[PDB]
CSV table of N, CA and C in Angstrom, one decimal:
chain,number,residue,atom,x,y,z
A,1,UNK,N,-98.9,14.8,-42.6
A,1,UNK,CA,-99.1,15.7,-41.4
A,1,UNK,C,-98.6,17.1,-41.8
A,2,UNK,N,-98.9,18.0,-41.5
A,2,UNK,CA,-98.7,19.5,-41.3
A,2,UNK,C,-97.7,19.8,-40.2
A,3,UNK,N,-97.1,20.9,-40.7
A,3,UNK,CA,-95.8,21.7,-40.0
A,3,UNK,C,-96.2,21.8,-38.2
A,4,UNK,N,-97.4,22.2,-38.6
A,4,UNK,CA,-98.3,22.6,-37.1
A,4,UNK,C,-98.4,21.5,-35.9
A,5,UNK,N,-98.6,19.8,-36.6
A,5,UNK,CA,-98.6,19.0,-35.7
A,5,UNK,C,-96.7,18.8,-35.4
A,6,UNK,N,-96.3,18.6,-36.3
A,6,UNK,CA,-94.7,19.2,-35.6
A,6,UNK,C,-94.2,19.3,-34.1
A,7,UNK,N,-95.0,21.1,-34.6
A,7,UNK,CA,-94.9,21.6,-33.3
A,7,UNK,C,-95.7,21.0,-32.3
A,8,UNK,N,-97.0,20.8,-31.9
A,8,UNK,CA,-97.7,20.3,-31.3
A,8,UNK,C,-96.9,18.6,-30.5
A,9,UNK,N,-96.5,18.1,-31.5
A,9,UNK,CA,-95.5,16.7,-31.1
A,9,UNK,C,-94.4,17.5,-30.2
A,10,UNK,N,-94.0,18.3,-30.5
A,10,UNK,CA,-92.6,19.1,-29.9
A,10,UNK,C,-93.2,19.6,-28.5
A,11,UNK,N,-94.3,19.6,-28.3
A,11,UNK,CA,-94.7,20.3,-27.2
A,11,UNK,C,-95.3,19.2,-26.3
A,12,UNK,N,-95.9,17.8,-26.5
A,12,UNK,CA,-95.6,16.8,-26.0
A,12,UNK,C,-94.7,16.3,-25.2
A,13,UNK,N,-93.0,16.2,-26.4
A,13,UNK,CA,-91.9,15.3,-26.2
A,13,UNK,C,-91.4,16.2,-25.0
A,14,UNK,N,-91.8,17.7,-25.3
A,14,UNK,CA,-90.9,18.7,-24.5
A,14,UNK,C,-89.7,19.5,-25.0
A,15,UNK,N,-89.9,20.2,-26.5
A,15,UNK,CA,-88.7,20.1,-26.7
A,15,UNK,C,-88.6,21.7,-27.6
A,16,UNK,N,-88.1,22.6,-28.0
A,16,UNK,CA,-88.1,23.7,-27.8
A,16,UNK,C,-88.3,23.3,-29.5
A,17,UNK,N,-88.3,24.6,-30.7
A,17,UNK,CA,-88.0,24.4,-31.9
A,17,UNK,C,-87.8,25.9,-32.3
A,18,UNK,N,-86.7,26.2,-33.0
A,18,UNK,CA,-86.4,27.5,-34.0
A,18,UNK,C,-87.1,27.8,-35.2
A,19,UNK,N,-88.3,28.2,-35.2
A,19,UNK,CA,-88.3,28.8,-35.9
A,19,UNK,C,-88.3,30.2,-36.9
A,20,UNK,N,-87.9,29.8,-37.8
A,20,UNK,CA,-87.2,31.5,-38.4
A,20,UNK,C,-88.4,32.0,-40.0
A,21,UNK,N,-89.3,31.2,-39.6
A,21,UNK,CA,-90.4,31.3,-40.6
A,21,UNK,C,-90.0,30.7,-41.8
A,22,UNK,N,-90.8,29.5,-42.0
A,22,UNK,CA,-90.6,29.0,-43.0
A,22,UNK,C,-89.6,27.5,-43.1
A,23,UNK,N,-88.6,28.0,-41.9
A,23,UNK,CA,-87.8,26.9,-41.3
A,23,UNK,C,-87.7,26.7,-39.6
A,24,UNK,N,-87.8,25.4,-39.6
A,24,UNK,CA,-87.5,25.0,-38.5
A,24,UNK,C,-86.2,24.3,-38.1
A,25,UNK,N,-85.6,25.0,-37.4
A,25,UNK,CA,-84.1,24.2,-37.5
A,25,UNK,C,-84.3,23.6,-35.7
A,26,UNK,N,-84.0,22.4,-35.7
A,26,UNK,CA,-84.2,21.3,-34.3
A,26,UNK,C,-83.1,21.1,-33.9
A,27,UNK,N,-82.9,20.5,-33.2
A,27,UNK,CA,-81.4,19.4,-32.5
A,27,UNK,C,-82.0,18.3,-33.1
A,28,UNK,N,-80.0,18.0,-33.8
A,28,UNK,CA,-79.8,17.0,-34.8
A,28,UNK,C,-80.7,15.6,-34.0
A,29,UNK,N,-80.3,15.2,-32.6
A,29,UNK,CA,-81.0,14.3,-31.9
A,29,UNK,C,-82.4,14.3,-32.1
A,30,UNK,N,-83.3,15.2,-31.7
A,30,UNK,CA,-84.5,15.4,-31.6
A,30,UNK,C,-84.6,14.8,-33.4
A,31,UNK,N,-84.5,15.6,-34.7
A,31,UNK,CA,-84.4,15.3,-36.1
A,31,UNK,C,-84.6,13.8,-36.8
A,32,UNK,N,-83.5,13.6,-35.8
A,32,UNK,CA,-83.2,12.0,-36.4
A,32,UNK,C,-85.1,10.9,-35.7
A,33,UNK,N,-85.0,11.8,-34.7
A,33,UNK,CA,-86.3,10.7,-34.1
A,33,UNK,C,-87.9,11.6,-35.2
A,34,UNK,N,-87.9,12.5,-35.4
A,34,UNK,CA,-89.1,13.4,-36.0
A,34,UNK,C,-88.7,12.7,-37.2
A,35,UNK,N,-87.6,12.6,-38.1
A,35,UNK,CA,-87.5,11.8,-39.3
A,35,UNK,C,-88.1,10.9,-39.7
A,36,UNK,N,-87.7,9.7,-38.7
A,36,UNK,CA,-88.3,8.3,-38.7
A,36,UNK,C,-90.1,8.3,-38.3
A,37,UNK,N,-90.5,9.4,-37.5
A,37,UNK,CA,-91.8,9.6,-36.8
A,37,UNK,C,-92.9,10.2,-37.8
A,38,UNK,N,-92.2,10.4,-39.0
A,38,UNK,CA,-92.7,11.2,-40.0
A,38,UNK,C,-92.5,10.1,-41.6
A,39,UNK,N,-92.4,8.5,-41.0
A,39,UNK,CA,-91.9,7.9,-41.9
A,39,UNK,C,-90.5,7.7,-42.9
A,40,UNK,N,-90.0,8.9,-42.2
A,40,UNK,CA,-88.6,8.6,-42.9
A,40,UNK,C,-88.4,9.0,-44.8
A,41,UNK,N,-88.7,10.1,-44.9
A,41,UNK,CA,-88.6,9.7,-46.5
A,41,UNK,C,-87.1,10.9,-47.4
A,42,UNK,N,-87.0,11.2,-47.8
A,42,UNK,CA,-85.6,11.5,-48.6
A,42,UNK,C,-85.4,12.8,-48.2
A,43,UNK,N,-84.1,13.0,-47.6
A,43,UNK,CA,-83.6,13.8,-47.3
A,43,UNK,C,-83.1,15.2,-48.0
A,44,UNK,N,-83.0,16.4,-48.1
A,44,UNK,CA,-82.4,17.4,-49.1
A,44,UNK,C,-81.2,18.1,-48.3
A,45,UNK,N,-80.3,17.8,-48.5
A,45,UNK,CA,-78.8,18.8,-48.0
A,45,UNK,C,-78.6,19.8,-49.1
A,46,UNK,N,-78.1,20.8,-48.3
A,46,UNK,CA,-77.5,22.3,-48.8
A,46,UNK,C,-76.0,22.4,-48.4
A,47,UNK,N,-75.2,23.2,-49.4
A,47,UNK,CA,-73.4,23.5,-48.9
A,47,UNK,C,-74.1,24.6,-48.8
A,48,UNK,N,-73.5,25.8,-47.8
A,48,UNK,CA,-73.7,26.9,-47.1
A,48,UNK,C,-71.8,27.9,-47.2
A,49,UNK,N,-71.4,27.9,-47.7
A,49,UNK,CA,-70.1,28.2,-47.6
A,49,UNK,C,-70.0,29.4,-46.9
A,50,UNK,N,-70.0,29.5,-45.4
A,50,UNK,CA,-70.0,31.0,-44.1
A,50,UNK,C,-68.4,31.2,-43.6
A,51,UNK,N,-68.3,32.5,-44.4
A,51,UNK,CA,-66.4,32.9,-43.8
A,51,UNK,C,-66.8,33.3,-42.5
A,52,UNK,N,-66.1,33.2,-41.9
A,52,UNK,CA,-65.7,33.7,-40.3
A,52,UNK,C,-65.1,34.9,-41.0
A,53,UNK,N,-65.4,36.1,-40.2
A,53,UNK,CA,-64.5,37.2,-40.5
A,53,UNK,C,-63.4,37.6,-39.1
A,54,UNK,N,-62.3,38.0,-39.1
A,54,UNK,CA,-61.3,38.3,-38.4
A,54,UNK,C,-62.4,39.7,-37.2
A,55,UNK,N,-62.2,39.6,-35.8
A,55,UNK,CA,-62.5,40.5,-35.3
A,55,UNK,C,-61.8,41.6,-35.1
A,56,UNK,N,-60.7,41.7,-34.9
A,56,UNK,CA,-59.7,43.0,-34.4
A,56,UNK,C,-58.5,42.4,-33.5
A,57,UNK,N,-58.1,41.4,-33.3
A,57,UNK,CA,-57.0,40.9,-32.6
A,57,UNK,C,-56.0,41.6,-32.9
A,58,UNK,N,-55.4,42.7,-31.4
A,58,UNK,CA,-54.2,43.0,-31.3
A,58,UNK,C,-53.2,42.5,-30.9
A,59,UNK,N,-52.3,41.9,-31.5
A,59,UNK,CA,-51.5,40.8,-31.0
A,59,UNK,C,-50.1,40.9,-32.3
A,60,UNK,N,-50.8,40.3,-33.3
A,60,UNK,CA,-49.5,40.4,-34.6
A,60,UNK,C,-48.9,42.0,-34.7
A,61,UNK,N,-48.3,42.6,-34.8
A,61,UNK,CA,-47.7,43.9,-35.5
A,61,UNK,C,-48.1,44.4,-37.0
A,62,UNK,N,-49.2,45.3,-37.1
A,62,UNK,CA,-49.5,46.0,-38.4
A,62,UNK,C,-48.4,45.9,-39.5
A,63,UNK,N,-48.6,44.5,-39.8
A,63,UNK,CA,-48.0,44.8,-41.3
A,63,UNK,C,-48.2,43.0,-41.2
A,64,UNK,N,-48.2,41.8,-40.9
A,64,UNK,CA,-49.5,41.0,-41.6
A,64,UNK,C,-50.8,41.2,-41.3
A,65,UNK,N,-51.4,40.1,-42.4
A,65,UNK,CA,-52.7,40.6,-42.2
A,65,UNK,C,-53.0,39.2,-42.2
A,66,UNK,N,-54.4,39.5,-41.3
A,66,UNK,CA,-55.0,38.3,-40.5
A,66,UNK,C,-56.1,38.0,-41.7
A,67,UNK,N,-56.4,36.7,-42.3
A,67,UNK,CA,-57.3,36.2,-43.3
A,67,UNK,C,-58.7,35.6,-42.7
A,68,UNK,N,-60.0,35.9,-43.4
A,68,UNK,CA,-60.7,35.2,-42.8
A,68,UNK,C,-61.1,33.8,-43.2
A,69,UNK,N,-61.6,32.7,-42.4
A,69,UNK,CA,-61.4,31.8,-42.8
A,69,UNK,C,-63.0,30.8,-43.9
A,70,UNK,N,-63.1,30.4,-44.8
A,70,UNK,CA,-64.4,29.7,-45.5
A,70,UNK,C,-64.7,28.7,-45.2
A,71,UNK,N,-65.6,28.6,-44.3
A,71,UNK,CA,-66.5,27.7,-43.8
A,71,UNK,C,-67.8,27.0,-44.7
A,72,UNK,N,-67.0,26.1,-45.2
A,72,UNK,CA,-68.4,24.9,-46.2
A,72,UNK,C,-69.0,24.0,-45.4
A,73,UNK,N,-70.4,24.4,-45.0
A,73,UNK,CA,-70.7,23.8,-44.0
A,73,UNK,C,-71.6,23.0,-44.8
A,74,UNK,N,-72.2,21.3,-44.4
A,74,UNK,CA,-73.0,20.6,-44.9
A,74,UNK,C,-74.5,20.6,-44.3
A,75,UNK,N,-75.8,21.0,-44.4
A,75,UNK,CA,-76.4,20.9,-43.5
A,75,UNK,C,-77.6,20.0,-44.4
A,76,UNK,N,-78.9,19.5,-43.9
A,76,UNK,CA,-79.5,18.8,-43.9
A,76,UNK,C,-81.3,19.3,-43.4
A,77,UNK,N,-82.3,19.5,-44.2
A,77,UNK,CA,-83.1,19.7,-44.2
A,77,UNK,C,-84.3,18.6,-45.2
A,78,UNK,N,-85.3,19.1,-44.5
A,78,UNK,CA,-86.9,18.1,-45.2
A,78,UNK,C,-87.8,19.3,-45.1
A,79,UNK,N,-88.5,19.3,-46.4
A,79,UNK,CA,-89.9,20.0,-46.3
A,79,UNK,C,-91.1,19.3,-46.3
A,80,UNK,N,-91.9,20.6,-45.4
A,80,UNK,CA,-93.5,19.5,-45.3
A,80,UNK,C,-94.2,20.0,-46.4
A,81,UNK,N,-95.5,20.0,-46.0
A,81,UNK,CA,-96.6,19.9,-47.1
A,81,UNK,C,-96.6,21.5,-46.9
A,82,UNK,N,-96.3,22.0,-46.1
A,82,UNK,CA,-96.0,23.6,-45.8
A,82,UNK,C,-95.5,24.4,-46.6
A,83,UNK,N,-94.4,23.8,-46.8
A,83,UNK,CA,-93.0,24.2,-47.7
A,83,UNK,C,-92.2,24.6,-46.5
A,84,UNK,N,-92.2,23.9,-45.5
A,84,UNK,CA,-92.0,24.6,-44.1
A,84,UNK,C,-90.0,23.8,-43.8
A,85,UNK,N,-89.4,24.0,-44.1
A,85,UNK,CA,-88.2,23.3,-44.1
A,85,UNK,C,-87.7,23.2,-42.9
A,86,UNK,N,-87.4,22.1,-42.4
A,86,UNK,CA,-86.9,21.3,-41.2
A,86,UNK,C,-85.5,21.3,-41.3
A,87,UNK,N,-85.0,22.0,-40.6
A,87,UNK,CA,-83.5,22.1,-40.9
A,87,UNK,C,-82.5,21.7,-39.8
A,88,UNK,N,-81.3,20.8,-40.2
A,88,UNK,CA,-80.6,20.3,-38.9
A,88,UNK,C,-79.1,20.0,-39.4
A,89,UNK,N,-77.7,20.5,-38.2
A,89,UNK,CA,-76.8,20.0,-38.5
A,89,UNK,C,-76.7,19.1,-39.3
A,90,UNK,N,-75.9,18.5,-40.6
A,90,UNK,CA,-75.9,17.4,-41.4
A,90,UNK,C,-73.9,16.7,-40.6
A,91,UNK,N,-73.6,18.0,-40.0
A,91,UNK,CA,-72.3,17.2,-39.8
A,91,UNK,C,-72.8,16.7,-38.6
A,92,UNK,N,-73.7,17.3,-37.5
A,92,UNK,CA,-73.8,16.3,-36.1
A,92,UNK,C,-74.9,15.4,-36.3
A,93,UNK,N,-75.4,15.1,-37.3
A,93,UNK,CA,-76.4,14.3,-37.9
A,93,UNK,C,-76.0,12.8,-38.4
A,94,UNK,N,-74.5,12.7,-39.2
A,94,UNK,CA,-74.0,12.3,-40.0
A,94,UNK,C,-72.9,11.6,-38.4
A,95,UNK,N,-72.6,12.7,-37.7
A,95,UNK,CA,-72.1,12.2,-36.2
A,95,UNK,C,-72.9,11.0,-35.6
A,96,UNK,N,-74.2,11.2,-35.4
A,96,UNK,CA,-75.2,10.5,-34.8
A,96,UNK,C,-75.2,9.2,-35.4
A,97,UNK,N,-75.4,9.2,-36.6
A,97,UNK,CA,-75.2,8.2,-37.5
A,97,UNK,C,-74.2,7.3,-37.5
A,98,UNK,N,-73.3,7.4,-37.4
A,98,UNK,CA,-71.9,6.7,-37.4
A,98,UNK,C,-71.7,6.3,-35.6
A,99,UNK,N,-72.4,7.1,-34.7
A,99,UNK,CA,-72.3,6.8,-33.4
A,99,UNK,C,-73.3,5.8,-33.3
A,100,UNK,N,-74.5,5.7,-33.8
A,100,UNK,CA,-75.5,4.5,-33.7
A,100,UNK,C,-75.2,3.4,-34.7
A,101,UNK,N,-74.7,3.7,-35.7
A,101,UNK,CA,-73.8,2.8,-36.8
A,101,UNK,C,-75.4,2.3,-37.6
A,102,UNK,N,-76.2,3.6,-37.7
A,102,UNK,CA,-77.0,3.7,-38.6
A,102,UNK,C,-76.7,3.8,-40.2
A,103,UNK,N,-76.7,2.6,-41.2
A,103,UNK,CA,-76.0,2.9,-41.9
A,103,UNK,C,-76.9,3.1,-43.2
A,104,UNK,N,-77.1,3.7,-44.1
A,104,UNK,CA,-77.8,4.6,-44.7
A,104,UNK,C,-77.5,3.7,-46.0
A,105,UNK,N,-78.7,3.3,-46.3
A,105,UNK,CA,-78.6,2.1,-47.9
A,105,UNK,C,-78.6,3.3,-49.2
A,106,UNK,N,-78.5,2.5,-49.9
A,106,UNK,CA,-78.2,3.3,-51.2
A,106,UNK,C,-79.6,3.5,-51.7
A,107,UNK,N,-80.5,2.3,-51.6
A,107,UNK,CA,-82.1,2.6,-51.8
A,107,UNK,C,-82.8,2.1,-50.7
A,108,UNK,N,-83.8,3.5,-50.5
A,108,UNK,CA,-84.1,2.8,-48.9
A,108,UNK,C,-85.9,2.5,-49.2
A,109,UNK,N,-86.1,1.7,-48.1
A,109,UNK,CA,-87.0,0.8,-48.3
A,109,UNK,C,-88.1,2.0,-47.9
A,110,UNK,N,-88.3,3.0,-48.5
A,110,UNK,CA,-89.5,4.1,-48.2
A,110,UNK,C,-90.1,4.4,-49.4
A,111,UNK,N,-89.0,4.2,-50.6
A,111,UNK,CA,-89.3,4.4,-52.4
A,111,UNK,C,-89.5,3.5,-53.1
């Protein structure tokens, strides 16, 4: 299938989709069901390491200094025939997972 019927299914189910060209980033729920809908086949995660930067909190007294903090974030994406990359939480994904006690084989029956 193409990126396009995606959408087209998304507009069916009822369901909004981000995209930022090139990617489509969903709700991890919505993902997990387009996954399996799309036969399920191997997954590609990215680390994203995003610092938070300090805003201006007046509160401490000028003389420490407030650090910003590195955010390694896990996330979780699939590309289509597009190159169109489906992108979704991998930590509320990995949530889902362990809340459905979907348990993820070491070789899965799609290869």
């Amino acid at each position: 299938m193409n990126s396009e019927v995606i959408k087209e299914f998304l507009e069916d189910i009822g369901e909004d989709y981000i995209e930022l060209e090139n990617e489509i980033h969903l709700k991890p729920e919505v993902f997990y069901e387009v996954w399996k809908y799309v036969g399920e086949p191997e997954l590609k995660t990215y680390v994203i390491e995003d610092e938070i930067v300090e805003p201006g909190e007046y509160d401490p007294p000028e003389m420490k200094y407030t650090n910003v903090k590195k955010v390694k974030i896990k996330k979780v994406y699939f590309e289509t025939l597009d190159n169109v990359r489906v992108v979704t939480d991998y930590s509320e994904f990995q949530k889902i997972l362990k809340k459905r006690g979907t348990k993820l084989e070491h070789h899965h029956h799609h290869h």
